[PDB]
Structures are given as C-alpha cells and as structure tokens.
C-alpha cells in the first residue's frame, strides 16, 4: 500500500496534466477548448472554495470520463483523436475508485546512513516549507507583473492593478489572489477561442498564434503559480495541524547568523528601499525617472526615522499610482519592472514601520572600528575610475576626511552625524544629476551603500565602546 499511498497524494495531478494534453492535441476545435475549460474549472474551485473542491473531486473526474467517452465514440488521424481521450479516462479510473478516498484522507487535516540521510532531509523539508509560506506572495506578484509587462494590453492590465494595489495595502492579499485566478482563466479561455477557424481577420489582448501551447503558456504558468501558492499554504497548515533572537547575536557566530536570517529586512530596510530607488534611476534614465529622484531627496532630508515613517504613507501610494500610469502610457515597458521591485520593497518597510511599534568578537571590531577606513578607500576609487568633474569631487572629499578623520571618529554624535550626512548628499546629487544630463551610476552606488552602512555603525551602541 506504499505506492497506493504515493498515488493517494502525488498522482491526482497526473489526471490534471492529462486534461491539458487532450485539450492541446492538434487543431483545437470547440470540444477540445471545452476540455480546457473543465480543467480550469477544477483548479479554480480549488482556490475559491477548498471544502467544495474536495467535495466534488472524483465525482467530477468521472463526469470528465463522461466527456471523453462521447468524443471518442463519435470521432490514424481520427483514431489518434480517440486514443488520447482514452488515455485520459484510464488515468482517471485508477485514482477515481482506488486512490481517491485515501487521498481525501491525506488531505483530511480536520540502512545506517539512510536513517541519517532521512533525518537530514527531514530538517531541510520542514525549513523550506516555513520560508515558502511567507515568501510566496512575492513570486506570485512578480510573475504576474513580468507577464503583463511584456504583453501590454487591456485585459492583462487588470492583473497589474490587482497585484499593485494589493502589495501596498496588504489586507487585500486574499481577494487579490481570488480575482487573479478567475481573470487569468478568462484570459486563457478568450485567447483560445481565438485560435478557431471562424475567428480570423490585439489591443484588448486576444490575438492569433500557432503554437497554441506556446501562445497560452505564459498565462497558464500564472494560474500555476497562484494555485501552487495555495497548495503550500494548506500543506504547511496540515503539517502543524497534525504534528535567532537578540540574545543569540551576542553569543556565537551561528547565533548571529540566525538573527539575520530571521531579521534583516526588519533592521536594514530603510537602507534597501533607498538602494532600490538608485537602481531605477540608473537603468531607465528617462524623464519619468526623475521624480523617483526627487522623492529620494525629500525623504532622505528628513533625517529622523520617525519623521520618515510619516511620509511612507505617501511614498507607497505614489509608487503604485506611477506604475499604473506608466503602464497606461505603454498601452496607449520591460524596464518598468524596476518600479515594481521598489513598490514591493517599500510596501514591506511600511510593515516594519507599524510592527516595531508593537571569533564573533573579532568580526565586531573589524566592522565597528576598521570600516570607516575602508569607506574612505572606496570614496577614492569611486572618483578615480570614472574620470569626470564629479569624480574630482570624490577625490577631494577623501583627502579632507583622511586629514580630519581622527577628530571625527571622536566627536559626539551630533557632529559625526552631520559630517556623514553631508557626504551622503554629494552622492545623491551626482546620481540625480548624471541623469538630468543624460560612465554611469554603478560606482556611485557601491559608494552609496558603504556610506549608509557607516551611518549605522556611527549610531550604534557598540560604537560607544
């Protein structure tokens, strides 16, 4: 019964895959397109109403066997169109009566070195589940954006709207998923009913193509992502249904490692949303990218984390209304993905901003003492690799900060901070300018990182020592 249980968990999808095979067996006429609709219906209900999906599993697979029958009976060329439906119904039969019930039971949440390997593999599995439970709205949202940024239309536009107004306001995430699934399927169905013989000669999305699979492959993978996400949610639910702190940082190296895998975007988050805005204005360099520049230099200027936390409400609204408007002006567009990667990062820092409200010794010396000195070498090599006028400015700031450096590393925070905040302005200006007047931004971005890291060392409690 080992293999029966394997089939009572990892083989229902064979029936689903076969559904597609039938639907895409050569020239798809109406009946093959309805076959697709049936496959879609199954997977869609899985998301919408899990309980009801489970209620009509094998019954519906047998109703499908009923479809395949009629086809083969009525309709070598003709025999190949009988063969495939037959193959489909055969697979169903096996699950239908023999593995369907123990599957409804697997979904019911309501030598020497082999044992060692099994334990190792077990650890991995559990951990990976946890990660993919929380980091999956990301990949869903990113893929539905990459698809609708390539195929600009007015029927894939709604998908951008969904995953770009549900990332800032994260209470909509469930309904985003729901409406995306139905709509992606509407797209799939319409585009297929356009590969017909009576449908012959684009803004609205629907067009004609000749690998019918290749054409409707993109939007099919989206349906896939969406559904796979729900599987992971419920699988992890089942696992626990049935069956890295601050202190750890100051103990061993592994203790610190854990603290950061747990929280990295918790702490270093304002810094990463600023290093994502520098990427937009470095890969796009147009004119609509200059407003991202002005936001950076009006958020950075309020130097207090608390004040910045009152402007984040508007930074996040702007970045979402700008992606939509720039894609309305691209329909009447594959670099607008940098305006997404940043609506993601910034929607996530809006979350930290409302949730904070609720041999290792060797490394700490070489980060909190001999790093100011490495930042100063980078300032030199930021301005002597790119020969320009702006580059001379960097050379001359290195010279000042090397001479009056010892005094700076000693002064009270007020002043240390003022001086480091001035050097940060030069960089943001060489970045906003190199754009307005157009050798690039890469070396000024390595620098913007280092200087934002040292602002954190100079404001710590470990620097007091």
UniProtKB/Swiss-Prot annotation:
Assembly notes: Homotrimer; the homotrimer forms a propeller-shaped Piezo channel with a cation-ion conducting pore. Heterotrimeric interaction may occur between PIEZO1 and PIEZO2. Interacts with PKD2. Interacts with STOML3. Interacts with TMC1, TMC2, PCDH15 and CIB2; the interaction may be part of the MET complex. Interacts with MDFIC (via C-terminus); the interaction prolongs Piezo channel inactivation. Interacts with MDFI (via C-terminus); the interaction prolongs Piezo channel inactivation.
Family membership noted in the UniProt record: Belongs to the PIEZO (TC 1.A.75) family.
Transmembrane segments: 6-26, 28-48, 59-75, 78-94, 139-150, 154-167, 182-196, 214-241, 269-284, 287-302, 316-331, 334-355, 359-385, 391-409, 423-438, 442-458
Protein purpose: Pore-forming subunit of the mechanosensitive non-specific cation Piezo channel required for rapidly adapting mechanically activated (MA) currents and has a key role in sensing touch and tactile pain. Piezo channels are homotrimeric three-blade propeller-shaped structures that utilize a cap-motion and plug-and-latch mechanism to gate their ion-conducting pathways. Generates currents characterized by a linear current-voltage relationship that are sensitive to ruthenium red and gadolinium. Conductance to monovalent alkali ions is highest for K(+), intermediate for Na(+) and lowest for Li(+).
Cytoplasmic side: 49-58, 168-181, 242-268, 303-315, 410-422
More about this protein: Piezo comes from the Greek 'piesi' meaning pressure.
Source organism of the structure: Homo sapiens
Gene that encodes it: PIEZO1
Disorder named in the UniProt entry: Dehydrated hereditary stomatocytosis 1 with or without pseudohyperkalemia and/or perinatal edema: An autosomal dominant hemolytic anemia characterized by primary erythrocyte dehydration. DHS erythrocytes exhibit decreased total cation and potassium content that are not accompanied by a proportional net gain of sodium and water. DHS patients typically exhibit mild to moderate compensated hemolytic anemia, with an increased erythrocyte mean corpuscular hemoglobin concentration and a decreased osmotic fragility, both of which reflect cellular dehydration.
Extracellular side: 27, 151-153, 285-286, 386-390
Compartments (UniProt record): Endoplasmic reticulum membrane; Endoplasmic reticulum-Golgi intermediate compartment membrane; Cell membrane; Cell projection, Lamellipodium membrane
Tissue: Expressed in numerous tissues. In normal brain, expressed exclusively in neurons, not in astrocytes. In Alzheimer disease brains, expressed in about half of the activated astrocytes located around classical senile plaques. In Parkinson disease substantia nigra, not detected in melanin-containing neurons nor in activated astrocytes. Expressed in erythrocytes (at protein level). Expressed in myoblasts (at protein level).
Whole-protein coverage range: 570 to 1309 of 2521
Name listed for the protein in its UniProt record: Piezo-type mechanosensitive ion channel component 1
């Amino acid at each position: 019964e080992l293999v029966k249980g394997v089939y009572a968990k990892y083989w229902i999808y064979v029936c689903a895959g076969m559904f597609i095979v039938v639907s895409f067996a050569g020239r798809l006429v109406v009946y093959k397109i309805v076959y697709m609709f049936l496959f879609l219906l199954c997977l869609t209900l899985f998301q919408v109403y899990y309980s009801l999906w489970r209620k009509l599993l094998k019954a519906f697979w047998w109703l499908v066997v009923a479809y395949t029958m009629l086809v083969l009976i009525a309709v070598s060329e003709l025999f190949s169109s009988i063969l495939v439906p037959g193959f489909f119904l055969l697979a169903c039969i096996l699950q239908l009566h023999y593995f369907h019930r123990p599957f409804m039971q697997l979904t019911d949440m309501e030598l020497e070195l082999a044992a060692g390997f099994s334990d190792v593999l077990s650890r991995v599995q559990v951990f990976l589940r946890r990660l993919l439970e929380l980091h999956v709205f990301k990949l869903v949202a990113l893929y539905t954006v990459w698809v609708a940024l390539k195929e600009v239309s007015v029927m894939n536009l709604l998908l951008v709207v969904l995953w770009a107004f549900a990332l800032p306001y994260p209470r909509f995430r469930p309904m985003a998923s729901c409406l995306s699934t139905v709509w992606t399927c509407v797209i799939i169905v319409c585009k297929m009913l356009y590969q017909l013989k009576v449908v012959n000669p684009n803004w609205f999305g629907v067009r004609k193509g000749f690998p019918n699979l290749g054409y409707i492959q993109n939007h099919l993978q989206v349906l896939l992502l969406l559904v796979f996400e729900a599987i992971v949610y419920r699988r992890q639910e089942h696992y626990r249904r049935q069956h890295g702190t601050r202190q750890q940082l100051d103990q061993d190296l592994l203790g610190c490692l854990k603290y950061f895998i747990n929280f990295f975007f918790y702490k270093f988050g304002l810094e990463i949303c600023f290093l994502m805005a520098v990427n937009v204005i470095g890969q796009r360099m147009n004119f609509l990218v200059t407003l991202h520049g002005c936001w950076l230099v009006a958020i950075l200027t309020r130097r207090h984390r608390q004040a910045i936390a009152r402007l984040w409400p508007n930074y996040c609204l702007f970045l979402a209304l700008f992606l939509l408007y720039q894609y309305l002006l691209c329909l009447g567009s594959t670099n607008l993905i940098s305006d997404f990667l940043l609506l993601l990062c910034a929607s996530q820092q809006w979350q930290v901003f409302s949730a904070e409200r609720t041999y290792l010794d060797m490394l700490k010396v070489a980060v909190f003492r001999y790093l100011f000195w490495l930042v100063l070498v980078v300032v030199f090599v930021t301005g002597a690799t790119r020969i320009s006028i702006f580059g001379l400015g960097y050379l001359l700031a290195c010279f000042y900060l090397l001479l009056f450096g010892t005094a700076l590393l000693q002064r009270d925070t007020r002043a240390r901070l003022v001086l480091w905040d001035c050097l940060i302005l030069y960089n943001v200006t060489v970045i906003i300018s190199k754009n307005m007047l157009s050798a690039g931004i890469i070396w000024d971005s390595v620098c913007f990182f280092f200087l934002l890291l040292q602002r954190r060392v100079f404001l710590s409690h470990y620097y007091l020592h």
